[PDB]
């Protein structure tokens, strides 16, 4: 439970927080260890890492992936690159 | 912009003097103007 | 992929191609030198943290190379256009440092048929290549100077008489 | 060298040349001793 | 890491042997000049090794410092060892190793660290000629 929370939080998918692209990180919700009091707090902490994964994946996706051989304006752009560069420093 | 626009100036500066001296090399030595 | 970049570089063609490969090997050493001088062993998370903002700059060069592949002017122009393509990212100084030495042999070459009268062409990197003594052939670079050097060197071959 | 330059230096059967050659060889040894004198003292190593 | 330090060593001993085998009374004119001009670079290599010698005397050195130390010297030893290999291989002497010293200086035009090296030995070798 100790390093498991941080590895889920670090943006690498957990082994108790099962990564879905349609339900994010989600605790297993049926083990003998968990009880409702810690459970809801764990689920609240899950959502921030869920967002962080999409953020870093977006940044990796739209920055530094082209040699510039055309091109699409929402899949590329000088503004998209500037956006991602700002986002990681935030 | 990443292009040569300050190194190419001392290059065209030599190209021009070369061509001027050759056109001069005709007239004031081999007398193409007399031809 | 660091290993397969050293696995990509090997040299004892083209002169500018050799200069480009040696400049790449001058960066692989830096990547090996930075490890064991900041990050030996720290928290487990710190290593994945430190070499994500550092590793991606290395990983762009795998996209850049063939990790067939351009040689000659086809390299020296394409890499030139990679300057104007990317100038506003983390991959601007590595492309800049590569182009600054991939044009290092060619700038000396141009400096020869203008001054001393020596025409240099031994790899097909030189642009101008093939009675009134002027029958020379001619069939990115700034086209403002491309025909200029063609007429300026044929002139020097006449002043050498 | 040193055996030959010891022997021939006072030899008059060998003539003037050879005492002169010995003088040359002594002068070469003079520059060789000054190095060795430093090298003994700077031992502490000396590779 | 110990295996990575070895190329300056194999390109030192080789560099020494060219100065030891070709100190003989006969060979070509340029090669006799070149031996006395390559030994100068062996001495300037030693002044860095002399700093290293003092440091090793004071009960201190580590492998990471040493690896960082020998990165500048490796290239100079590489250039000298390649020159020694080429001069011995081609059976060139006299003036035909004044051609090789002339060609190798033109060949390097991307860094000019080794171009100047071939230039220095050629400027020393053309002084008696």
Q: What is the dihedral of CA E54, E58, E59, E60, to 10 degrees?
A: -60
How many whole angstroms separate alpha carbon B30 and alpha carbon E64? Answer: 72
Q: Which residues of A touch C82 (CB under 8 A)?
A: 67-68
Answer yes or no: are the C-beta atoms of A14 and A4 closer than 8 Å.
yes
* Displacement of CA E75 from its chain's centroid (Å): 9
In 3D space, the residue among B16, B33, B22, B28 whose CA is nearest the CA of residue C159 turns out to be B22
Locate all alpha helices (DSSP H) within A1-90, ordered by sequence. Answer: 2-9, 36-62, 78-89
* E and C make contact (3+ CB pairs below 8 Å): yes
Cβ–Cβ below 8 Å for E110 and C105: yes
| Residue C34: closest C-alpha in chain E | E68
**Å resolution of this model?**
8.7
Answer yes or no: are the C-beta atoms of C102 and C76 closer than 8 Å.
yes
CB count within 10 Å of CB C93 equals 10
3-state DSSP assignment of residue C41: coil
How many whole angstroms separate alpha carbon A86 and alpha carbon A62? Answer: 13
- How would DSSP label each residue in chain B? --S-SSSSHHHHHHHHHHHHHHHHHIIIII-TTT-
> Which chains contact E through at least 3 pairs of Cβ atoms less than 8 Å apart?
C, D
| Full 3-state SS string of chain E | CHHHHHHHHHHHHHHHHHHHHCCCCCCCHHHHHHHHHHHHHHHHHHHHHHHHHHHHHCCCCCHHHHHHHHHHHHHHHHHHHHHHHHHHHCCCCCCCCCCHHHHHHHHCCCCCCCHHHHHHHHHHHCCCC
Answer yes or no: are the C-beta atoms of C101 and C26 closer than 8 Å.
no
- Kindly list the distances between the CA atom of residue C148 and the CA atoms of A44, B8, C116, E13, E82, in Å, as whole numbers in the listed order: 70, 12, 17, 52, 40
| Residue B17: closest C-alpha in chain C | C152
Q: Which residues of C touch E (CB under 8 A)?
A: 15, 18-19, 22, 29, 33, 36-37, 101, 104-105, 108
C104 to chain E, closest Cα gap in Å: 6
Answer yes or no: are the C-beta atoms of E100 and E86 closer than 8 Å.
yes
Answer yes or no: are the C-beta atoms of C130 and C137 closer than 8 Å.
yes
């Amino acid at each position: 439970m100790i390093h498991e929370l941080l590895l889920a939080l670090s943006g690498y998918p957990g082994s108790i927080f099962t990564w879905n692209k349609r339900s994010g990180l989600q605790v297993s919700q049926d083990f003998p260890f968990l009880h409702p009091s810690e459970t809801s707090v764990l689920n609240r902490l899950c959502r921030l890492g869920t967002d962080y994964i999409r953020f870093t994946e977006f940044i990796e996706q739209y920055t530094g992936h082209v040699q510039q051989q055309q091109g699409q304006g929402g899949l590329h752009g000088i503004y998209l690159r500037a956006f991602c560069t700002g986002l990681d420093s935030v | 912009v990443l292009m040569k626009r300050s190194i190419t100036a001392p290059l065209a500066a030599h190209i021009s003097l070369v061509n001027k001296a050759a056109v001069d090399y005709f007239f004031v030595e081999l007398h193409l103007e007399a031809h | 992929c660091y290993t397969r970049l050293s696995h990509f570089s090997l040299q004892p063609k083209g002169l500018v191609f050799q200069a480009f490969t040696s400049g790449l090997r001058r960066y692989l050493q830096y990547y090996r030198a930075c490890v064991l001088s900041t990050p030996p062993t720290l928290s487990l998370l710190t290593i994945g943290f430190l070499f994500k903002k550092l590793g991606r700059q290395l990983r762009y060069l795998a996209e850049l190379c063939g990790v067939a592949f351009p040689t000659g002017v086809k390299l020296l122009s394409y890499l030139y256009q990679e300057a104007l393509h990317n100038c506003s990212n983390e991959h601007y100084p590595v492309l800049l440092s590569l182009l600054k030495t991939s044009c290092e042999p060619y700038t000396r070459f141009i400096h020869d048929w203008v001054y001393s009268g020596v025409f240099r062409d031994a790899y097909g990197e030189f642009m101008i290549q093939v009675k009134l003594y002027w029958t020379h052939g001619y069939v990115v670079f700034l086209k403002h100077i491309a025909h200029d050097i063609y007429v300026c060197g044929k002139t020097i071959n006449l002043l050498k008489l | 060298i040193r055996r030959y330059t010891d022997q021939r230096s006072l030899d008059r059967s060998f003539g003037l040349v050879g005492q002169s050659f010995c003088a040359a060889l002594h002068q070469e040894l003079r520059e060789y001793y000054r190095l060795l004198s430093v090298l003994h003292s700077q031992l502490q190593s000396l590779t | 890491l110990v295996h990575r330090i070895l190329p300056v060593a194999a390109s030192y001993s080789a560099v020494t042997r060219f100065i030891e085998e070709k100190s003989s009374f006969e060979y070509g004119q340029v090669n006799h000049a070149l031996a006395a001009a390559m030994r100068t670079l062996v001495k300037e290599h030693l002044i860095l090794v002399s700093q290293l010698e003092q440091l090793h005397r004071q009960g201190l050195l580590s492998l990471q410092k040493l690896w960082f130390y020998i990165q500048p010297a490796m290239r100079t030893m590489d250039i000298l060892a390649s020159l020694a290999t080429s001069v011995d291989k081609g059976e060139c002497l006299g003036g035909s190793t004044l051609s090789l010293l002339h060609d190798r200086s033109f060949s390097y035009t991307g860094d000019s660290q080794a171009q100047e090296l071939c230039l220095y030995l050629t400027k020393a070798a053309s002084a008696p000629y």
